[PDB]
Point group: D3
Chain length 267, copies 6
């Protein structure tokens, strides 16, 4: 469009017409979604109430869990293998409370999630098989996020959603009968410092806290004394943004903005 007079107009036409970007009800049509978590519990803690709301509407929610949570205990007589047996059950129970379908366990070791083509391939296979309408994953640009598994899951999820659409990427998948990942599915990023879409989870907050504490191994009383205020405060930082008590924040952008975009901060 050669004759438009200001950046601001252009950007506006770009968002609303060219890209028809819409934060009003961005999960309106979804039938199936994947929620990707670095560790068992992260989906519920980041977006449990949202997962529930989706379930409630008849959306199929599938988990993909990058690691086994092997490392997450201070108990010197609980091995990582035992912990991981336990966290699997804990996540199955938590997810059942949220109406969640199915979990894909990638089984990478807790704290050792690689950042590699290999991991992109695992996700790409799930993506291609399930062809979901939207994907959720932690925002790897969250500042002071000191857990490598979190930053890497984030990155790998965004990369995989783009690359799994390309037939020459992980090409054996197509050779065993899968199609590339279908275009026009959304990415939504939770655990974000810059959300631009909030789900009100005021009514659901006690459901979320319950489903979080089901991961008992992660949440004994002395830990919960700190974690419950923390989780509640986080939910209020998000909710206030839409004038409600408790929210879950997401960052959702048009696919182009994840690449060469110097004005991403205008959504």
């Amino acid at each position: 469009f050669e004759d438009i007079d200001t950046f601001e107009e252009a950007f506006n036409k770009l968002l609303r017409e060219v890209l028809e970007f819409d934060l009003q009800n961005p999960f309106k049509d979804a039938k199936k979604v994947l929620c990707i978590e670095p560790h068992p519990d992260d989906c519920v803690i980041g977006m449990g109430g949202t997962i529930k709301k989706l379930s409630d509407m008849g959306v199929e929610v599938i988990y993909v869990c990058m690691t086994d949570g092997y490392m997450g205990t201070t108990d010197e007589s609980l091995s990582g293998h035992e912990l991981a047996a336990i966290r699997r059950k804990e996540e199955e129970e938590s997810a059942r409370l949220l109406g969640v379908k199915k979990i894909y366990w990638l089984n990478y070791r807790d704290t050792e999630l690689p950042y590699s083509r290999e991991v992109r391939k695992d996700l790409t296979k799930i993506l291609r098989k399930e062809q979901p309408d939207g994907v959720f994953a932690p925002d790897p640009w969250l500042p002071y996020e000191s857990h490598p598994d979190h930053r890497r899951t984030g990155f790998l999820a965004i990369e995989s959603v783009a690359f799994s659409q390309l037939p020459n990427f992980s090409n054996t998948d197509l050779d065993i009968g899968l199609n590339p990942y279908n275009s026009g599915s959304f990415i939504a990023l939770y655990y974000t410092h810059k959300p631009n879409y909030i789900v009100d989870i005021t009514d659901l907050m006690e459901l979320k806290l319950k489903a979080i504490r089901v991961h008992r191994s992660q949440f004994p009383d002395d830990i919960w004394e700190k974690w419950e205020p923390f989780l509640r405060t986080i939910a209020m930082f998000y909710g206030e943004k839409i004038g409600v008590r408790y929210g879950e924040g997401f960052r959702i952008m048009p696919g182009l903005f994840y690449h060469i975009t110097p004005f991403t901060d205008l959504i």
Copy 2:
């Protein structure tokens, strides 16, 4: 000696550092423009490249990868596409006056982040000894192409380390010199440009040389990308009151290390 930080900084920039952004490319005879994929040089600084050629600067591309993955055409393999994209780029660069292209040949979506790639770029720096280097800004927020983050990091690193005789010393052992210490670094694809080039006059050219990457810009995909790319050129151009612009971030060499007030330029 000096009283305030505000004063101390100013003196740093202008006296001690000589940092000056009015004409940062006025003394440039040879430059490298480093791109992660074929087409990134033209999309991100195609108009500036034209401007540099027309001025007589020699402009040399270094493309990190082969564009192998860039198609949804299931009847086009990566190898075929890679061979087409080197053609596309050769024609695209002629239009902008581009001399020479070094292809490193890493696979698209697979550019490593490692000492090996630093050694490939170092060997080129030491060979060509350019006056300035262009590369994507590795800090662009929400940049989710690893090839992009990786390129910018490795470019800035390599410009530094290629200067060190003990770094990839085999280069010296075979007759190369360490990379000269006077050169500039300019990052394109940047959210914090502190230097903008007006390409309002060149915009139609820029767009034609982009379109020359036909594998990347079929008809339906240009339906979003021409509007996208104009909208970005307006973003940079507005910063200096022109229609279309190209944004570059530039900084004294020092600021890339241990510097808490980099947002002051």
Copy 3:
């Protein structure tokens, strides 16, 4: 909680009451600290002043130096090996002046610091042996930090401080009779663009400068022309923030804020 009215109230309760956080005097009880540095001289440059005052208060200050500084010369006649043996001597004398106990050399090669589990296990074994009260390290989120040794030292430091506390992490340390790293120690990040604790070093500035120049292989006369003003200017950026002439800046935060936290900018 659960009754608190607003996000602003929750946040302040969380910070001060639940998490017991305050930056009045965060090094108060410290008997032993590790100063983790990517290259010989980084401890002196970013926190040389603070080290001295810690020595002065009778705190045992220990260095961990991630790499050998192999690459840090433009002299064609000086091999990397020769340089490393020099820089070690330089560090030892620079550290004498700051009253510095003892230095662990990891001996990774300058410019080639891995970002790997192996390096966490190196840090972890040290933390488990020393059991420091506090650990200092570069902020790996510093804008525009382009030395991979710095960003990587920073992230590895934060990660090791968490993981060294887990008994299933690097479990052989335990099998050889080291204990998990003790829980309550602090983290302080230097070379930072968002400091929230400032140490006045104004009275110490000349000693700091002398202790840096002791790295003569790094600061001959021609480089010192650029670097002395630079170093003075950084120290004034930090000093200004609390109204003293010369300062050293540090970023400190509750432990929980290193993970999924979306309002880390409020401190």
Copy 4:
């Protein structure tokens, strides 16, 4: 079996009864096989006549080709990408002469085949999908084999055939609907210094040479002047072993012998 009197008897009962190992007609029942090659052309050069014989009998032969042959030319105006386009066509044409079904291209770069869990996963997916009755691959113990791609394909093929049977190995495959690789398929190793099964390829030798030269890019006249004597001599080393002019040799052992077996040299 507690009361057997010599090693030699035991070993004999072990082979013939316990393991019912049979080198008489070891491909008798196969319906589908995979032939794994490091580069395009290796299946034909190592075992072209055998592939043909299998085709002839109605066996489905599927290729898996580890690399793209990107590196295999001395022509300074033929890029690796062009070479690889060309070698794909060359292999399609060669394979058509041998009755070959289908080729899986892993697309790893020629000379850069990794030795990694990732590559095991690609093979494991093909194995699980196709469930073939037997697999062929170069013998990685062939002495003085100086091509890394050859040694690694060999190893990876033997490992994958064992690991793809295990449900916890590459577990996402089972989560997208695949079953583990079925038990009791044979491995046969070509390019071997110790074959214990030879296929007579006297009648087929000229077919093989033709299908080898179809890879024109690899076989110009000046190269063929050396390669044709070489290939013929190799085929006679194998054939003489069964008193025929030209053979293809394989090493075939019972699955147990690929693990902890100190008497493998007795077959």
Copy 5:
């Protein structure tokens, strides 16, 4: 001085090297038996281990991996299996008199071949300072388990390098000493044993302690493996005229480096 190679070699072995295979474990108070998976120590040298315990030697296992992949039971995950296999191994080792087990915890089928693993074993060598080390022979032909090749290589390497103060120096920095220089290395699972232990008397014990790894030896799988394992014990036993034996390859430390006549022992 000396006239023939045959003479020069002999003198090497016996005078200069003191290499002597009649009772190589006569002076051994503590030994490490390094296994790639839980059960390899008992399968490969279970009877010898028994013999060493009964003699008073302290026997310490170092297991490289967790056995995570070792089941076709689709209702048993790797983590569950790993937790069962550590139990299995604890019971199995008690029966043979085994003290202590170091678990390194790498995943089964994933043991890296790297400096990191050498540092884990080195830390144990330096801690425990054993008199001898047992490990699989990395040269077994047709050994196709990477965990197996990898273990033997890393064991022999680590025994060497743990002796070097500059190697994993942090160990020293925290109070450990380099690994003492007097110790032996013996490779089991070997096709070229030059020392055989008669375990004819212990064979039923060996087999019971193997069976204790019940996850690995259901009924139908033991239908092949008991015959397999007896057939291997006959292989080694025949070498010295006994019914069942365990084969070890042993060599002067020198022979592991630059030695063209290693087949002469």
Copy 6:
């Protein structure tokens, strides 16, 4: 061919006529050679004698030393860095005695030589610059060789000699105006258990020994007691094979026999 009667006849025709192979005088035309060594001293130990005779004939002999020898000391007071600077001095003087031109130091760390494309590119750039007539390197198939630096130097050497001849391999070398490595050069492997060419060094033995001992950091009196007999014994193992007192052994083969060849034991 195609008419030849027996395998034994084919093989001898192949070796002698097609491949022009013979070990009468394989270094005849050599003007320039690389002696590739894994650690400082390996060239002198395995082929010190042969080097001298090459110098003596006026051949330019160049060393490539893969690593710095950092680890090679039991002295707790001598750092790896210090050792490397020493060993370089030792090499330089040891090489003066063998009339050795010039040494390329790659500077990988003793014990940590990668097995990677990066290292082939290091060798390749050297071969393309020097264009040697011959390359000497350790046999990576030596029985029981337990130093990973040796096996890896050996395989990397053979691989680089092939790949450096391909223009698409490390193509940037070409873009900077180096040529592919010239085709007809020979490969000779030392530290070998199957030598097929023997150099009489009997008259040179005392000089060899002096040139090794010049590595005093490696051979103090106590280690020399073990090592002098050892070195004498190896030289007699090789000498015996051609009826001289002291020899150096080398394995040489046609190029084709480095790949898929099943009768490499016939030479």
